[PDB]
Design a protein around this ligand. Structure first.
Ligand code: HEM
Ligand code: HEM
Lengths: 363, 362
């Protein structure tokens, strides 16, 4: 459990084991030159091969010419690879550049406006994303800081989010993590072991209509604030009725164990699990891979905390869109607000040492 | 994942080995009722005994009356104590309430203005603080959230700071961590095992003039922004000349190993280590216990990066103040800006199960 292989038919960081920490960054492109952007994707891919093996970028962090800036900023020296994965994605706004408008996938759909949205434009969208996941947050931050530095003059950082899940040194791998509302989160999800369910619900197929995306996936990111101080004043019964599971064991109502299959008719009609379940959505099923956040306190002394929701799917129109539409009457809506949003096409994997991020799109 | 003992002559979270994560909160007091404030300190102490042992506060996180809110918010259920420490401090502004004016320690000094200061008043000061440190960020957030909930109507959060990784060491036997400039930070500190140096430089003594503070310490907090665009285009030689140590090993200039003693005359006259060293400051020595932070982007296309600097000392006048005055000509000033400040009196330890935070003052 020290490194995750970078090369594959698929990018790592989707179906590979969930790491303890997240640094997610969205970038905007500042160049109009296609050749200069392809050169960056090749340099970024070379850096990512070094970073995911626990090596410094370029000629290293020290021991070069004294009169040159070092190639690597040095804050990860002495740390382990920490299961780092680096996953790149392309936003809809990238396809307005470089003559790409006819290669935007139909599955990379713009999201509709949903009831109760309060999206901050500054923390939404982006031409590009890099998802950096690792067990050590300094390994993740060092990766984003050095990719941003390599890209300076061709890309800028639009927005950045730090996140946390479990701490693996102290918490067993099989234990479901709790979200900041104190409920177990992830019980009924697609697991990385389920190869057929990934082919059906997560990976883009050649016959889906966009050949360059074969073996890729589609990502939806939502920054969802929780109203923590309001939630903490709710009764135990009110909290359990919102979800349709009990708080201690996380069993479905009228069942005994966390992994018992739910009986949807025993839950309240607007309970979150009942509305989100595939049987309520024509079989629509998601891979959730999100992380908790706590950024600090706002001007009223309230905790700025919530869930940085990440979902992967074969098609945004048949995954996130139908399920989020069905949450229009969710009992949870009283306690949350969606304040950031973005969608990305995540290309296929880097096949070998000579391949590079985006090679199927750019040629 | 083990517990750090909560009781002692001193509070834990100072000499204790430095934990991976920080959640620091400053609170302002909103009650004028002395008895109501004393009742809060006792309830907070009872909660801290549970939290530091990995137990839920009050009657627990579930299995109570369905129609009542749970006593514990529940997001730490099934987690280990994770070396949680909870350290309380009292700000100078507290002493204007509850008839405490004559008990303000002389050693709790207001800081002067320093050249280059750009202090945000909203994220400075505070009537009191809680430093939560743990190896698990969820355990630290759970502690601050449950203390703030218990204090509803008597205290409000003024400002908070999360630290994602440590930039300090009280354990010279373990690897020294790096700050976001890529240098080891904590080589020449005070170790938790150096009992003589802790008595000389960190713990307040009865003869210092404030009996209620005997066994306590004084805390300076400084929020420091880093100019990483400016730093990352500097040459390797410029970076090493700024500090007086090499970047790869962290050895003093000319020497082979991190822990070899500095030879100050080989460093540039404005080198950070040369200006900050005790021999440059009449023997003034600090216990540094800070953490790195990043709070998103700056809105100008760049990552935000900084260091939340924490120093403990026996007297602010003989610790932080002379060292920071000597840093007026530091080469590092080109790459940093102080943007937040606070000082606190950290009372003595909770002696046993009948004692309570602040009992020697109140
Ligand atoms: C802060 C926001 C949210 C919280 C706190 C939350 C919490 C939970 C919890 C506690 C569960 C039950 C345990 C489990 O199976 O994971 C659950 C299930 C689920 N949630 Fe949410 N959720 C949130 C937002 C969303 C959103 C935005 C979507 C999709 C658009 C979503 C889709 C689901 C799905 C599909 C399930 C599994 C239902 C099943 O098949 O049984 N959730 N969520
Ligand atoms: C962003 C701000 C700062 C950075 C990046 C930084 C960095 C460093 C580094 C790399 C070292 C050498 C390794 C070590 O012995 O710890 C060091 C030493 C030291 N720093 Fe700083 N520092 C900063 C701010 C401060 C401040 C504000 C003070 C006190 C007012 C301070 C006091 C010291 C002391 C006392 C030493 C040890 C010198 C010795 O005895 O050898 N530092 N710092």
């Amino acid at each position: 459990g020290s490194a995750v292989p970078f090369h594959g038919a698929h990018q790592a960081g989707i179906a590979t084991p969930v790491q303890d920490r997240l640094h997610f960054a969205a970038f905007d492109v500042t160049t109009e030159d296609r050749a200069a952007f392809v050169a960056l994707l090749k340099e970024w891919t070379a850096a990512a091969r070094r970073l995911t093996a626990g090596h410094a970028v370029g000629e290293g962090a020290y021991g070069g010419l004294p009169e040159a800036p070092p190639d690597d900023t040095g804050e990860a020296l002495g740390l382990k690879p920490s299961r780092l994965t680096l996953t790149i994605g392309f936003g809809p706004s990238l396809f307005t550049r470089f003559g790409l408008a006819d290669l935007r996938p139909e599955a990379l759909a713009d999201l509709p406006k949903f009831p109760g949205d309060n999206l901050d434009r500054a923390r939404s969208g982006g031409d590009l994303c890099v998802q950096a996941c690792a067990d050590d947050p300094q390994v993740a931050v060092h990766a984003i800081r050095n990719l941003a530095r390599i890209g300076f003059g061709k890309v800028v950082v639009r927005w950045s989010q730090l996140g946390f899940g479990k701490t693996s040194s102290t918490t067993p791998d099989k234990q479901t993590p709790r979200n900041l509302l104190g409920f177990k989160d992830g019980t009924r999800n697609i697991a990385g072991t389920e190869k057929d369910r990934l082919d059906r619900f997560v990976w883009a197929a050649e016959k889906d209509g966009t050949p360059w995306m074969t073996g890729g996936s589609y990502l939806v990111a939502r920054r969802i604030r929780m109203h923590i101080e309001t939630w903490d004043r709710a009764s135990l019964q009110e909290q359990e009725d919102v979800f349709g599971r009990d708080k201690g064991e996380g069993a479905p109502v009228g069942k005994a164990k966390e992994r018992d299959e739910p009986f949807l008719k025993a839950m309240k009609p607007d309970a979150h699990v009942r509305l989100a379940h595939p049987d309520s959505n024509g079989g629509a099923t998601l891979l959730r891979r999100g992380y908790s956040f706590t950024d600090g306190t706002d001007g009223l002394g309230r905790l700025d905390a919530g869930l940085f929701f990440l979902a992967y799917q074969r098609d945004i129109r048949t995954g996130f869109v139908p399920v989020q539409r069905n949450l229009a009457t969710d009992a949870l809506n009283e306690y949350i607000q969606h304040v950031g949003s973005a969608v990305f096409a995540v290309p296929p994997g880097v096949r070998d040492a000579d391949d590079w991020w985006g090679s199927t799109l750019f040629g």
